[PDB]
Amino acid sequence: AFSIDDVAKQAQSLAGKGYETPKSNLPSVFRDMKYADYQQIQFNHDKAYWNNLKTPFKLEFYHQGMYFDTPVKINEVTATAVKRIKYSPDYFTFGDLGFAGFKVLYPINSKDKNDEIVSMLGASYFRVIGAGQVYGLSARGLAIDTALPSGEEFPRFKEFWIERPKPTDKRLTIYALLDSPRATGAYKFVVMPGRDTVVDVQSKIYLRDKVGKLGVAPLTSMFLFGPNQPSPANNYRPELHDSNGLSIHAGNGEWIWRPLNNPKHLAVSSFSMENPQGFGLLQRGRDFSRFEDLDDRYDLRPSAWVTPKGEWGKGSVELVEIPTNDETNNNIVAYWTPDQLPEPGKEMNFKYTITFSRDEDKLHAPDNAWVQQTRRSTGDVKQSNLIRQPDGTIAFVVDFTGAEMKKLPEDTPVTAQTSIGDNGEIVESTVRYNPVTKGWRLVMRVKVKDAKKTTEMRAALVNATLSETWSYQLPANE
Amino acid sequence: AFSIDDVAKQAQSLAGKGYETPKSNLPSVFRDMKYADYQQIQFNHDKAYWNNLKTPFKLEFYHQGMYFDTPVKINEVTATAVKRIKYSPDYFTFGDLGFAGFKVLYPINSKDKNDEIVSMLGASYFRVIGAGQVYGLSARGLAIDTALPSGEEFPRFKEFWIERPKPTDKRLTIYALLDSPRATGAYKFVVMPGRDTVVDVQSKIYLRDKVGKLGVAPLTSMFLFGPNQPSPANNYRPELHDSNGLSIHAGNGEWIWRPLNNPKHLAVSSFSMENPQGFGLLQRGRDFSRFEDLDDRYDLRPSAWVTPKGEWGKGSVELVEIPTNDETNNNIVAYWTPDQLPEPGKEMNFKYTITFSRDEDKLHAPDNAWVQQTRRSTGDVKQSNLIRQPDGTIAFVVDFTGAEMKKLPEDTPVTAQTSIGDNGEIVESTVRYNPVTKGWRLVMRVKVKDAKKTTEMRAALVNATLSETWSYQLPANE
Numbered sequence: 001a002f003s004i005d006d007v008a009k010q011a012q013s014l015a016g017k018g019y020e021t022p023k024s025n026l027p028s029v030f031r032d033m034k035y036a037d038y039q040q041i042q043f044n045h046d047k048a049y050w051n052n053l054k055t056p057f058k059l060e061f062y063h064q065g066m067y068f069d070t071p072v073k074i075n076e077v078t079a080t081a082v083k084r085i086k087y088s089p090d091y092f093t094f095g096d097l098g099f100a101g102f103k104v105l106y107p108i109n110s111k112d113k114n115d116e117i118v119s120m121l122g123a124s125y126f127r128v129i130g131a132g133q134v135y136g137l138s139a140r141g142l143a144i145d146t147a148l149p150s151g152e153e154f155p156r157f158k159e160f161w162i163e164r165p166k167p168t169d170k171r172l173t174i175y176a177l178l179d180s181p182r183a184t185g186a187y188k189f190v191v192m193p194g195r196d197t198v199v200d201v202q203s204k205i206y207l208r209d210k211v212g213k214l215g216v217a218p219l220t221s222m223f224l225f226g227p228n229q230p231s232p233a234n235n236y237r238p239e240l241h242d243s244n245g246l247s248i249h250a251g252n253g254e255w256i257w258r259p260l261n262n263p264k265h266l267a268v269s270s271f272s273m274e275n276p277q278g279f280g281l282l283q284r285g286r287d288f289s290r291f292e293d294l295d296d297r298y299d300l301r302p303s304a305w306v307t308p309k310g311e312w313g314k315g316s317v318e319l320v321e322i323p324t325n326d327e328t329n330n331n332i333v334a335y336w337t338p339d340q341l342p343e344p345g346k347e348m349n350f351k352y353t354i355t356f357s358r359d360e361d362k363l364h365a366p367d368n369a370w371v372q373q374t375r376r377s378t379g380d381v382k383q384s385n386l387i388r389q390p391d392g393t394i395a396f397v398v399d400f401t402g403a404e405m406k407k408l409p410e411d412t413p414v415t416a417q418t419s420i421g422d423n424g425e426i427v428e429s430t431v432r433y434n435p436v437t438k439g440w441r442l443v444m445r446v447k448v449k450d451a452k453k454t455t456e457m458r459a460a461l462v463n464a465t466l467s468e469t470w471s472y473q474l475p476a477n478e
Numbered sequence: 479a480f481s482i483d484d485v486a487k488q489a490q491s492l493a494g495k496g497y498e499t500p501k502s503n504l505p506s507v508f509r510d511m512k513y514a515d516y517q518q519i520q521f522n523h524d525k526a527y528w529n530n531l532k533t534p535f536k537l538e539f540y541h542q543g544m545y546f547d548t549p550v551k552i553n554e555v556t557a558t559a560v561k562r563i564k565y566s567p568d569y570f571t572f573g574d575l576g577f578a579g580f581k582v583l584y585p586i587n588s589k590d591k592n593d594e595i596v597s598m599l600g601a602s603y604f605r606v607i608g609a610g611q612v613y614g615l616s617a618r619g620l621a622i623d624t625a626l627p628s629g630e631e632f633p634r635f636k637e638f639w640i641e642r643p644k645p646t647d648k649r650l651t652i653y654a655l656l657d658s659p660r661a662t663g664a665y666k667f668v669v670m671p672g673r674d675t676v677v678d679v680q681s682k683i684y685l686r687d688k689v690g691k692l693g694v695a696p697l698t699s700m701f702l703f704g705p706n707q708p709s710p711a712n713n714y715r716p717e718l719h720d721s722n723g724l725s726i727h728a729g730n731g732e733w734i735w736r737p738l739n740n741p742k743h744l745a746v747s748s749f750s751m752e753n754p755q756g757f758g759l760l761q762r763g764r765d766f767s768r769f770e771d772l773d774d775r776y777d778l779r780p781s782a783w784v785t786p787k788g789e790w791g792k793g794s795v796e797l798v799e800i801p802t803n804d805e806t807n808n809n810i811v812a813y814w815t816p817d818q819l820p821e822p823g824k825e826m827n828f829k830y831t832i833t834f835s836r837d838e839d840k841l842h843a844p845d846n847a848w849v850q851q852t853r854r855s856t857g858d859v860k861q862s863n864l865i866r867q868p869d870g871t872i873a874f875v876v877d878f879t880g881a882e883m884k885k886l887p888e889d890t891p892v893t894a895q896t897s898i899g900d901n902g903e904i905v906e907s908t909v910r911y912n913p914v915t916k917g918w919r920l921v922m923r924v925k926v927k928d929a930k931k932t933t934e935m936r937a938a939l940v941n942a943t944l945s946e947t948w949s950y951q952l953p954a955n956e
């Protein structure tokens with residue numbers, strides 16, 4: 001009955017007309033709120049949608065506040081009707097504005113507890129979690145001109161339709177209409193809560209005008225510090241980040257792992273390929289000892305893996321790393337950016353799944369080893385007297401692990417194929433067996449010729465390829 | 479037949495005569511050796527003592543080299559004889575000097591592998607390990623004038639007698655004669671290899687002249703950096719130390735835990751008491767993730783716990799912390815120093831056990847919680863906008879755990895009784911439940927008034943005492 005086509009015709013139609021700028025009529029008392037103040041507004045769980053039905057799903061809504069200062073329209077779809085969900089203040093306690101966004105609840109952790117699984121709130125952003133997870137990185141519907149000096153353009157999901165589920169349904173269907181100065185689109189999301197929460201996405205996109213850069217299936221995260229770039233000041237937390245790497249499964253079948261930085265200057269990195277097999281911002285390594293944060297539980301925050309359905313043609317998986325002095329800034333972005341876009345008006349179809357998981361092993365081929373961690377260190381040489389003498393190099397300790405690598409005999413003759421750009425020199429490239437992890441450790445020591453330039457390096461473990469490619473960048477002014 | 483009395487009469491007799499300075503006739507080629515060079519000398523395992531007997535014990539010997547440049551005499555005791563073990567170069571390959579010291583082998587880890595359990599080498603030092611352990615901290619027979627500006631005096635074990643074991647014996651008996659400018663002594667060690675290796679010690683000590691300070695049952699270790707005092711430079715190792723705290727079981731029954739520092743200036747700390755119940759340099763926290771060192775395995779290095787037999791009267795358990803830029807210096811010392819020593823010639827009896835273990839829980843009363851770790855951090859206040867704003871305080875995150883604490887209901891109302899010296903002010907003293915550890919976490923934030931003075935603080939968890947006392951010192955110029 002109702003389908004993506006219904007929403008695509010609105011999108012098609014919006015693309016053919018001048019963009020209408022949303023206008024805020026939000027009172028100052030709400031717009032001026034900071035996060036802590038925004039908490040004063042809570043939803044009345046007695047008024048949650050589907051409270052009268054035998055579904056484990058429920059729908060709750062956000063009030064406008066902070067920079068969430070334009071309304072979105074929300075519709076329920078039934079077998080027989082599309083019904084606007086009417087706004088009311090009586091959905092909230094505060095101790096015709098319109099909803100800011102919505103969330104979905106489901107007993108994903110405990111049978112008699114309705115826990116959040118999806119949050120759609122801000123622009124075209126959503127956050128998703130599976131069982132035992134805590135909200136971390138975000139996804140968007142679309143990105144336009146991300147990292148361009150001209151200024152990024154942020155689409156919004158301005159309207160939603162949410163199908164009322166049947167009592168036995170284990171998935172939830174959501175449609176969204178996207179509008180942005182130079183683009184519109186129609187989105188069908190099928191959400192499947194589980195150990196992982198999986199989101200099936202179909203999109204239909206239309207430019208209203210030409211753009212510098214489109215970013216398809218965007219992910220947005222945060223990296224403040226980690227063992228590859230330790231906290232400049234003492235912190236009880238060894239690490240702080242919603243993600244620690246970009247994993248790519250290339251067109252050509254190579255696995256690439258780019259550990260994240262919090263750089264001094266904006267860094268955009270393009271992995272140019274044809275027909276990407278997948279990409280994800282991953283949180284690899286979940287021992288609580290790596291984080292020690294009892295409030296935000298970064299150890300419990302998901303990885304997100306994007307899997308295209310079909311051939312996305314020629315473009316790049318692009319990473320954006322933004323300087324931040326704190327964790328409140330989303331300083332990591334990843335997307336697919338097509339090399340060539342169509343003329344305005346012409347429809348682009350993108351189909352993909354997003355998997356939100358804490359099983360990074362499952363987000364990787366079992367016959368291909370992967371980097372558990374990248375530890376930076378002062379490069380040294382142990383003297384005859386056992387004193388470790390610094391020699392001016394930087395050292396990277398890169399531990400590989402894997403479902404198949406953890407199985408290999410200790411005596412397996414593993415070596416490293418490495419490379420470095422011109423601003424750097426590899427002094428040492430050693431591989432040894434790690435009997436604690438059943439994996440293999442690479443130690444790479446490098447001299448930087450000019451600290452004021454970027455240095456890029458690559459490494460993989462081979463017998464005679466066993467591992468993904470560690471693709472590391474050492475930011476200028478590090 | 480043979481007993482400690484045999485050795486005590488030699489000791490008694492040496493104390494009544496002028497001290498004879500040992501003389502080195504070691505060739506330059508050996509004295510000039512650094513550790514790596516000293517390795518060139520290996521013992522011929524075919525010539526190990528007791529190779530002709532049905533004992534799991536074996537005895538091997540060290541060649542002189544480095545600063546091990548005076549001989550020690552070694553004797554075997556049998557039922558019928560004391561026999562000098564004759565020196566020979568044919569005990570070694572090099573690819574009448576006399577032995578430098580000896581080691582004991584035993585199948586403590588694997589049934590057909592003779593692994594080291596005891597090393598007696600250098601002055602009056604020995605190192606001991608149980609099953610699955612790697613050599614770490616040391617013990618001595620005695621310490622004299624440790625940390626005194628006049629200069630420490632180092633006794634040596636100049637002669638040893640080692641009882642030949644019966645085939646079924648699970649212990650080994652060793653006697654040693656101690657000589658030092660101003661003191662002599664006789665030592666019986668009974669070594670019991672196990673999961674822990676336990677050393678039963680009887681000593682008889684005689685001063686040849688008055689001394690500034692005697693140190694009974696000394697332990698010697700090393701602390702380079704840890705989470706309470708993180709590596710000033712990037713290191714892949716989160717921590718590096720053979721020990722991370724002094725545990726005291728006081729005369730009065732209090733448990734005290736003093737986390738170690740690598741200070742900028744010599745720090746001596748005295749815990750004055752009567753009838754100490756025990757003390758030990760402990761390595762608390764053995765996840766490999768804390769160390770990451772595959773060469774030296776600090777995670778596998780023992781704790782040593784000293785248990786007096788009898789009442790040692792009035793004195794102090796004393797800790798000495800020495801500045802070091804590297805791990806090769808033994809910059810941690812602990813001992814019992816009597817308040818009052820007898821006149822020279824008069825015999826002092828000290829009986830005690832040393833337990834070398836990796837079960838720190840077993841080195842502590844089950845009804846008393848203990849500090850798993852002390853993490854230093856920049857003190858901050860989270861703002862309304864979730865940004866953590868530094869306020870100029872230093873924060874200590876102190877996690878408690880325990881066989882009984884891990885059992886307590888989460889809702890148990892645990893609070894902290896704390897205190898600080900005059901150079902400091904406690905701004906925050908918070909206790910929360912740690913659901914990952916089943917323990918409780920203390921966060922203490924303090925302002926230092928003068929960074930150029932030492933600051934001391936104490937804290938314990940109480941219901942209405944649950945924990946040992948965390949006795950922390952913040953070194954001047956930290």
Ligand SMILES: OC[C@H]1O[C@@H](O[C@H]2[C@H](O[C@H]3[C@H](O[C@H]4[C@H](O[C@H]5[C@H](O[C@H]6[C@H](O[C@H]7[C@H](O[C@H]8[C@H](O[C@H]9[C@H](O[C@H]%10[C@H](O[C@H]%11[C@H](O[C@H]%12[C@H](O[C@H]%13[C@H](O[C@H]%14[C@H](O[C@H]%15[C@H](O[C@@H]%16[C@@H](O)[C@H](O)[C@@H](CO)O[C@H]%16O)O[C@H](CO)[C@@H](O)[C@@H]%15O)O[C@H](CO)[C@@H](O)[C@@H]%14O)O[C@H](CO)[C@@H](O)[C@@H]%13O)O[C@H](CO)[C@@H](O)[C@@H]%12O)O[C@H](CO)[C@@H](O)[C@@H]%11O)O[C@H](CO)[C@@H](O)[C@@H]%10O)O[C@H](CO)[C@@H](O)[C@@H]9O)O[C@H](CO)[C@@H](O)[C@@H]8O)O[C@H](CO)[C@@H](O)[C@@H]7O)O[C@H](CO)[C@@H](O)[C@@H]6O)O[C@H](CO)[C@@H](O)[C@@H]5O)O[C@H](CO)[C@@H](O)[C@@H]4O)O[C@H](CO)[C@@H](O)[C@@H]3O)O[C@H](CO)[C@@H](O)[C@@H]2O)[C@H](O)[C@@H](O)[C@@H]1O
Nearest residue numbers: 115116119121122123125134135138154222327328329330
């Ligand atoms: O019944 C029974 C019982 O119960 C109980 O209880 C219980 C429970 O239960 C319950 C349940 O619960 C649940 C839970 O809950 C919880 C909660 O939760 C929640 C959550 O919260 C959280 C939070 O979150 C938050 C967030 O955060 C985040 C973030 O991120 C984010 C973001 O934000 C941001 C932003 O963004 C934006 C964007 O941006 C972009 C950009 O752009 C920009 C630009 O930029 C540029 C640059 O520039 C720069 C700037 O910016 C700056 O400013 C400067 C200065 O500095 O700098 C510079 O540089 O530049 C560059 C170069 O040049 C460029 O390129 C760029 O562009 O800028 C501009 C300016 O100029 C601007 O404007 C713009 O914007 O860009 C970039 C690039 O591209 C990118 O990347 C970015 O992105 O933008 C856009 C457009 O516009 C927008 O839209 C956005 O917004 O930004 C800012 C700045 O800008 C910042 O600030 C921020 O931050 O956002 C987004 C969107 O929205 C998102 O997505 C994201 O996420 O951050 C971080 C990262 O970084 C992360 O990490 C975080 O997380 O945030 C937001 C806002 O604010 C909010 O909204 C939220 O909220 O978080 C925290 C922390 O972490 C945590 O803690 C929390 O938690 O949330 C959610 C939502 O999301 C909700 O839903 C939830 O609810 O919480 C609470 C506390 O509070 C608690 O309490 C609770 O619990 O949960 C769980 C899970 O987890 C579950 O499971 C559960 O279930 O619930 C239910 C329902 O309700 C009920 O029923 C129940 O009850 O449970 C539990 C468990 O189990 C238990 O325990 C309990 O017990 C009770 O009590 C009783 O009674 C009962 O009985």
Ligand SMILES: OC[C@H]1O[C@@H](O[C@H]2[C@H](O[C@H]3[C@H](O[C@H]4[C@H](O[C@H]5[C@H](O[C@H]6[C@H](O[C@H]7[C@H](O[C@H]8[C@H](O[C@H]9[C@H](O[C@H]%10[C@H](O[C@H]%11[C@H](O[C@H]%12[C@H](O[C@H]%13[C@H](O[C@H]%14[C@H](O[C@H]%15[C@H](O[C@@H]%16[C@@H](O)[C@H](O)[C@@H](CO)O[C@H]%16O)O[C@H](CO)[C@@H](O)[C@@H]%15O)O[C@H](CO)[C@@H](O)[C@@H]%14O)O[C@H](CO)[C@@H](O)[C@@H]%13O)O[C@H](CO)[C@@H](O)[C@@H]%12O)O[C@H](CO)[C@@H](O)[C@@H]%11O)O[C@H](CO)[C@@H](O)[C@@H]%10O)O[C@H](CO)[C@@H](O)[C@@H]9O)O[C@H](CO)[C@@H](O)[C@@H]8O)O[C@H](CO)[C@@H](O)[C@@H]7O)O[C@H](CO)[C@@H](O)[C@@H]6O)O[C@H](CO)[C@@H](O)[C@@H]5O)O[C@H](CO)[C@@H](O)[C@@H]4O)O[C@H](CO)[C@@H](O)[C@@H]3O)O[C@H](CO)[C@@H](O)[C@@H]2O)[C@H](O)[C@@H](O)[C@@H]1O
Nearest residue numbers: 593594597599600601603612613616632700805806807808
């Ligand atoms: O058969 C089958 C198969 O097998 C195979 O193989 C296998 C195997 O098997 C086998 C077995 O094996 C085994 C193993 O083995 C191994 C080995 O092992 C070994 C070991 O080694 C190790 C090492 O060790 C070493 C050591 O080290 C250590 C150290 O410590 C020590 C010490 O040292 C030090 C010194 O000390 C001294 C003292 O000092 C004191 C002081 O005083 C001083 C003064 O001071 C002052 C100050 O001042 C300062 C100065 O000093 C400076 O200089 C400056 C400048 O800077 O500064 C300043 O400041 O001041 C202050 C304030 O003012 C004051 O207070 C002070 O006083 O000064 C002066 C000057 O002026 C001076 O003079 C003086 O001295 O004081 C303080 C205070 O009180 C104190 O504390 C201190 O103490 O002093 C004294 C008197 O004089 C002396 O005596 C001493 O010496 O010092 C120096 C400086 O001074 C330094 O440098 C040094 O370092 O020492 C002591 C004594 O001796 C001891 O006790 C200790 O320990 O260090 C650290 C700490 O720190 C530690 O940690 C370490 O450890 O060292 C030594 C010397 O050098 C040597 O001797 C040794 O050796 O270590 C390393 C590292 O860690 C390691 O790595 C190694 O390992 O050793 C042992 C012995 O001990 C032996 O025995 C053994 O053997 O190793 C190798 C490698 O190499 C390997 O390879 C092997 O493996 O083991 C295990 C266990 O672990 C076992 O289990 C096993 O069994 O064996 C058998 C038999 O042989 C056979 O049979 C078999 O075969 O097994 C394995 C496992 O299972 C496997 O894997 C394999 O495979 C094969 O191959 C095949 O073929 C076959 O088939």
